[PDB]
Nucleic acid binder design. Sequence first.
DNA 1: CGAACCTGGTCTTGACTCCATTGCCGGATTTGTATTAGACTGGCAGGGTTGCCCCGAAGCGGGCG
Length: 49
Amino acid sequence: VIPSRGAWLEFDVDKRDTVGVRIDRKRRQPVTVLLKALGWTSEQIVERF
DNA sequence: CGAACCTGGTCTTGACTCCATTGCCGGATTTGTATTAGACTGGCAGGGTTGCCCCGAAGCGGGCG
């Protein structure tokens, strides 16, 4: 997700079957942690996915 | 055959002129330092976006003692 003058972010499936948020070129950081950082429950994730 | 002549360099005397060269000397300018008393109390900030290669370092899984 490329913005103009913002901050990059990526959701890359690794060598294993794990999706990972890389915000502003940080480390692997799986995406359910990012949804919980949006306050999304694990139940809300389960309902969504 | 001998005597003067005028004039080249070669040099000397002494007076005249003119300008460097300090030395003050007084003033102008300029370089550095100090001092401001109400209260103020943690920064903005884009280059990064390659490809490939070698290698050093962390980190964890794996067997292990």
